[PDB]
């Protein structure tokens, strides 16, 4: 039963700086793999390491890059060639075409047209097997590139082996950071050379220099295959060698099979039927993208116990560690998805977070590998609390709570996105002022508020002191401090307490991050009713939502000076100011449920799923962002979305398929039957849950886990009476 056939790793690779259609590369990897491998079309150092329209491949690279914007670390490449032994990354490059390329999560193949060589790779979590099919030539070589900024290489002929380490990175690493790699060939070298800053040196065994490389070679018969076993570690050569054992004695075929099995095992936890081939492809591609980040950053020791290099303090320590995710993106639904279908995995991740705190002093917000300065918010709180509240509990709860509290009153000395920048003002005034030299104050305030709700939630659960509990309950209401009654919008506010003037609701950035007031105003995940109230009741609230879609996509970019890609992405979709291409607004359509008009959510949700996602190389409508934008589709296609992580609630949308089945780790299954689904029939007329009638606009975690059947009768006309009753509404803090 194979779902991998639907996965297109090229989806999102046809992106450019001006317009993102995903900004992804073909991550050939195991789920959450420590090391990813990709064909490399971009020049060394370029965030866009693989682009669909590129003509040439210049290497097969080990990568850890989460985003072109964030860039890479622990990176080196290998490239087979023929003819002259050349190290230069342009001269070694080869034309190829996509019709001569086969990309799957577990297997990658391509024909290098200028060398007449076929390259195949199959990876494990930490290692990979390459098989090079050479033409007949007296001069066949393999180039190993350690990249620049200080690297090391060494050839061991008596073991047909090349070892080295690479260090080029993009920040967020300890001074001693290194990636140690080992490469074993099954064919003896007739030619060997190391490379030292572009210089080829035959028979010099070893280089320690800015940019080390190696070239080995031999005579090849037509069709002769040479295999290279490769692995790496962030710990040591000894450890890299241990990692190499993941390959066993397997060949390309056997490893591919194991990787396929591995992926089907996770993709198969969600079976969908009764859709068209585009939908299958969009859906599983998205699911695959949701099982990559954060990556494992731990390695197995002699006793099979997890240990890790600390990207926070550079020691090697026992226990789990993961990295390469930005919580500002992924708290929204990516991690919620893990808690629903892959809690065993998130348990490891959560334990990793505890270690991050122990080793770093803070919980991370953006980590690649270590703390990096990107985005805003203290959403690690949502990640941590949502997990706990959903049954994924770390062993050290004392430490968890302390960590949470620590982050409310500290900001990292060098990485301002770690901890709460502006906490002094926030704690004192109730908001982060628009005029105190802290940017994106309004976005910070709104998210901090939701964060504090999460802390309140956990604190209550821990039966902490009333004074504590009350303090966060109070701070959860801070979003009110930025609400402008006249505009009905969230708005920047001065320290002196006056709202900021001139006010441009359509201006991006400044008070907000990559969105304007019309996008950020909806960021009250824990208290939609509270928001509804400030706007003057649900009717006015719905009017307000509706105009998001109804107005042209006009904008003010003065804060950026140029039409950044996320603005352009909005303009072209012709859906008003609904910028689905970016994270802040992604939950918004579901808010219709809270105002007693679920049918409007049903209508627009189906719009988005039909129009904003296609299965091709230009498949997404904005940055994919480490699973967030993909998992949005995954949830939404199933029919529900975790608007407010930290509750046990998935707010109801509309299911895309005629049947979906979930297999939870607990052994139960849940079937969602929508036999009458169609392109036309995207309204929910009625719903029953194991035979009971279900008029609510949400489902509960514990209920889903019990399994059974949900029936959804789809219709082509909205049902104006379902889900308008007050007990149908999802959670709002104000109602508590
Ligand atoms: O997604 C936000 C953030 C990502 O978290 C990391 C890449 C750069 N940024 C783009 C923003 O939209
Ligand atoms: Ca983004």
PDB file of C-alpha atoms in Angstrom, residues 96-221:
ATOM      1  CA  UNK A  96      20.440  17.629 -16.885  1.00  0.00           C
ATOM      2  CA  UNK A  97      16.728  17.679 -17.439  1.00  0.00           C
ATOM      3  CA  UNK A  98      13.789  16.811 -15.186  1.00  0.00           C
ATOM      4  CA  UNK A  99      12.665  14.078 -17.574  1.00  0.00           C
ATOM      5  CA  UNK A 100      16.073  12.485 -16.845  1.00  0.00           C
ATOM      6  CA  UNK A 101      15.577  12.846 -13.113  1.00  0.00           C
ATOM      7  CA  UNK A 102      13.549  10.777 -10.623  1.00  0.00           C
ATOM      8  CA  UNK A 103      12.943  12.298  -7.186  1.00  0.00           C
ATOM      9  CA  UNK A 104      11.309  10.457  -4.283  1.00  0.00           C
ATOM     10  CA  UNK A 105      11.713  10.965  -0.557  1.00  0.00           C
ATOM     11  CA  UNK A 106      13.671   7.693  -0.293  1.00  0.00           C
ATOM     12  CA  UNK A 107      15.497   7.614  -3.613  1.00  0.00           C
ATOM     13  CA  UNK A 108      16.995  10.052  -6.085  1.00  0.00           C
ATOM     14  CA  UNK A 109      18.319   9.505  -9.595  1.00  0.00           C
ATOM     15  CA  UNK A 110      19.550  11.765 -12.343  1.00  0.00           C
ATOM     16  CA  UNK A 111      21.442  11.571 -15.624  1.00  0.00           C
ATOM     17  CA  UNK A 112      24.365  14.013 -15.823  1.00  0.00           C
ATOM     18  CA  UNK A 113      24.384  14.771 -19.526  1.00  0.00           C
ATOM     19  CA  UNK A 114      27.833  16.302 -19.804  1.00  0.00           C
ATOM     20  CA  UNK A 115      29.575  13.365 -18.118  1.00  0.00           C
ATOM     21  CA  UNK A 116      27.355  10.535 -19.301  1.00  0.00           C
ATOM     22  CA  UNK A 117      26.993   9.442 -15.689  1.00  0.00           C
ATOM     23  CA  UNK A 118      23.934   8.246 -13.787  1.00  0.00           C
ATOM     24  CA  UNK A 119      23.869   9.150 -10.080  1.00  0.00           C
ATOM     25  CA  UNK A 120      21.577   7.510  -7.541  1.00  0.00           C
ATOM     26  CA  UNK A 121      21.333   8.120  -3.814  1.00  0.00           C
ATOM     27  CA  UNK A 122      19.355   6.499  -0.993  1.00  0.00           C
ATOM     28  CA  UNK A 123      19.707   7.848   2.524  1.00  0.00           C
ATOM     29  CA  UNK A 124      19.133   6.740   6.089  1.00  0.00           C
ATOM     30  CA  UNK A 125      18.726   9.068   9.049  1.00  0.00           C
ATOM     31  CA  UNK A 126      22.407   9.887   9.197  1.00  0.00           C
ATOM     32  CA  UNK A 127      24.034   8.146   6.247  1.00  0.00           C
ATOM     33  CA  UNK A 128      23.591   7.716   2.520  1.00  0.00           C
ATOM     34  CA  UNK A 129      24.537   5.382  -0.313  1.00  0.00           C
ATOM     35  CA  UNK A 130      25.537   6.750  -3.723  1.00  0.00           C
ATOM     36  CA  UNK A 131      25.799   4.588  -6.804  1.00  0.00           C
ATOM     37  CA  UNK A 132      27.558   6.136  -9.782  1.00  0.00           C
ATOM     38  CA  UNK A 133      27.136   4.471 -13.165  1.00  0.00           C
ATOM     39  CA  UNK A 134      30.129   5.559 -15.229  1.00  0.00           C
ATOM     40  CA  UNK A 135      30.633   5.466 -18.961  1.00  0.00           C
ATOM     41  CA  UNK A 136      33.686   3.871 -20.522  1.00  0.00           C
ATOM     42  CA  UNK A 137      36.553   6.207 -19.787  1.00  0.00           C
ATOM     43  CA  UNK A 138      40.185   6.124 -18.771  1.00  0.00           C
ATOM     44  CA  UNK A 139      39.538   9.156 -16.579  1.00  0.00           C
ATOM     45  CA  UNK A 140      36.575   8.849 -14.289  1.00  0.00           C
ATOM     46  CA  UNK A 141      36.721  10.849 -11.069  1.00  0.00           C
ATOM     47  CA  UNK A 142      34.710  11.647  -8.002  1.00  0.00           C
ATOM     48  CA  UNK A 143      35.042  15.124  -6.472  1.00  0.00           C
ATOM     49  CA  UNK A 144      34.514  15.656  -2.754  1.00  0.00           C
ATOM     50  CA  UNK A 145      33.913  19.253  -1.723  1.00  0.00           C
ATOM     51  CA  UNK A 146      34.209  20.296   1.952  1.00  0.00           C
ATOM     52  CA  UNK A 147      33.059  23.846   1.223  1.00  0.00           C
ATOM     53  CA  UNK A 148      34.885  26.902   2.483  1.00  0.00           C
ATOM     54  CA  UNK A 149      35.305  28.976   5.652  1.00  0.00           C
ATOM     55  CA  UNK A 150      37.729  26.448   7.154  1.00  0.00           C
ATOM     56  CA  UNK A 151      37.431  22.756   6.336  1.00  0.00           C
ATOM     57  CA  UNK A 152      39.522  19.604   6.372  1.00  0.00           C
ATOM     58  CA  UNK A 153      40.034  16.618   4.085  1.00  0.00           C
ATOM     59  CA  UNK A 154      42.152  13.457   4.099  1.00  0.00           C
ATOM     60  CA  UNK A 155      42.524  10.569   1.682  1.00  0.00           C
ATOM     61  CA  UNK A 156      43.180   7.071   3.007  1.00  0.00           C
ATOM     62  CA  UNK A 157      43.987   5.005  -0.040  1.00  0.00           C
ATOM     63  CA  UNK A 158      44.547   1.780   1.916  1.00  0.00           C
ATOM     64  CA  UNK A 159      40.899   1.851   2.872  1.00  0.00           C
ATOM     65  CA  UNK A 160      39.445   3.399  -0.299  1.00  0.00           C
ATOM     66  CA  UNK A 161      38.322   6.130   1.995  1.00  0.00           C
ATOM     67  CA  UNK A 162      38.016   9.884   2.179  1.00  0.00           C
ATOM     68  CA  UNK A 163      37.324  11.600   5.464  1.00  0.00           C
ATOM     69  CA  UNK A 164      36.909  15.276   6.277  1.00  0.00           C
ATOM     70  CA  UNK A 165      35.008  17.924   8.157  1.00  0.00           C
ATOM     71  CA  UNK A 166      33.045  20.920   6.986  1.00  0.00           C
ATOM     72  CA  UNK A 167      32.263  24.068   8.989  1.00  0.00           C
ATOM     73  CA  UNK A 168      30.643  26.630   6.703  1.00  0.00           C
ATOM     74  CA  UNK A 169      27.525  27.896   8.478  1.00  0.00           C
ATOM     75  CA  UNK A 170      25.071  30.728   8.703  1.00  0.00           C
ATOM     76  CA  UNK A 171      25.296  31.522  12.415  1.00  0.00           C
ATOM     77  CA  UNK A 172      23.943  29.972  15.598  1.00  0.00           C
ATOM     78  CA  UNK A 173      26.813  27.572  16.223  1.00  0.00           C
ATOM     79  CA  UNK A 174      29.360  27.204  18.962  1.00  0.00           C
ATOM     80  CA  UNK A 175      32.986  28.104  18.222  1.00  0.00           C
ATOM     81  CA  UNK A 176      33.951  24.409  17.949  1.00  0.00           C
ATOM     82  CA  UNK A 177      31.255  23.521  15.410  1.00  0.00           C
ATOM     83  CA  UNK A 178      32.207  20.809  12.900  1.00  0.00           C
ATOM     84  CA  UNK A 179      30.521  18.243  10.738  1.00  0.00           C
ATOM     85  CA  UNK A 180      32.694  15.124  10.489  1.00  0.00           C
ATOM     86  CA  UNK A 181      32.151  12.947   7.406  1.00  0.00           C
ATOM     87  CA  UNK A 182      33.441   9.628   6.081  1.00  0.00           C
ATOM     88  CA  UNK A 183      33.213   8.281   2.532  1.00  0.00           C
ATOM     89  CA  UNK A 184      33.995   4.695   1.572  1.00  0.00           C
ATOM     90  CA  UNK A 185      34.382   3.670  -2.091  1.00  0.00           C
ATOM     91  CA  UNK A 186      34.108   0.076  -3.297  1.00  0.00           C
ATOM     92  CA  UNK A 187      36.679   0.739  -6.066  1.00  0.00           C
ATOM     93  CA  UNK A 188      40.387   1.405  -5.509  1.00  0.00           C
ATOM     94  CA  UNK A 189      41.779   4.846  -6.449  1.00  0.00           C
ATOM     95  CA  UNK A 190      44.127   4.925  -9.402  1.00  0.00           C
ATOM     96  CA  UNK A 191      44.341   8.683  -9.029  1.00  0.00           C
ATOM     97  CA  UNK A 192      44.221  10.792  -5.942  1.00  0.00           C
ATOM     98  CA  UNK A 193      44.551  14.455  -5.161  1.00  0.00           C
ATOM     99  CA  UNK A 194      43.506  16.849  -2.448  1.00  0.00           C
ATOM    100  CA  UNK A 195      42.551  20.394  -3.212  1.00  0.00           C
ATOM    101  CA  UNK A 196      43.726  23.440  -1.375  1.00  0.00           C
ATOM    102  CA  UNK A 197      42.037  26.703  -2.147  1.00  0.00           C
ATOM    103  CA  UNK A 198      41.412  25.812  -5.754  1.00  0.00           C
ATOM    104  CA  UNK A 199      44.873  24.213  -6.190  1.00  0.00           C
ATOM    105  CA  UNK A 200      44.942  20.596  -7.263  1.00  0.00           C
ATOM    106  CA  UNK A 201      47.700  18.626  -5.488  1.00  0.00           C
ATOM    107  CA  UNK A 202      48.198  15.104  -6.668  1.00  0.00           C
ATOM    108  CA  UNK A 203      49.234  12.633  -4.002  1.00  0.00           C
ATOM    109  CA  UNK A 204      49.130  15.134  -1.152  1.00  0.00           C
ATOM    110  CA  UNK A 205      47.057  13.171   1.381  1.00  0.00           C
ATOM    111  CA  UNK A 206      45.685  15.888   3.620  1.00  0.00           C
ATOM    112  CA  UNK A 207      44.500  19.483   3.743  1.00  0.00           C
ATOM    113  CA  UNK A 208      43.581  21.790   6.613  1.00  0.00           C
ATOM    114  CA  UNK A 209      42.641  25.017   4.928  1.00  0.00           C
ATOM    115  CA  UNK A 210      39.871  27.463   4.129  1.00  0.00           C
ATOM    116  CA  UNK A 211      38.386  25.323   1.362  1.00  0.00           C
ATOM    117  CA  UNK A 212      39.492  21.673   1.325  1.00  0.00           C
ATOM    118  CA  UNK A 213      38.561  19.178  -1.358  1.00  0.00           C
ATOM    119  CA  UNK A 214      39.528  15.832  -2.806  1.00  0.00           C
ATOM    120  CA  UNK A 215      39.466  14.201  -6.247  1.00  0.00           C
ATOM    121  CA  UNK A 216      39.908  10.459  -6.697  1.00  0.00           C
ATOM    122  CA  UNK A 217      39.741   8.536  -9.958  1.00  0.00           C
ATOM    123  CA  UNK A 218      40.089   5.341 -11.943  1.00  0.00           C
ATOM    124  CA  UNK A 219      39.436   3.666 -15.289  1.00  0.00           C
ATOM    125  CA  UNK A 220      35.837   2.589 -15.845  1.00  0.00           C
ATOM    126  CA  UNK A 221      34.153   0.104 -18.177  1.00  0.00           C
TER     127      UNK A 221
END
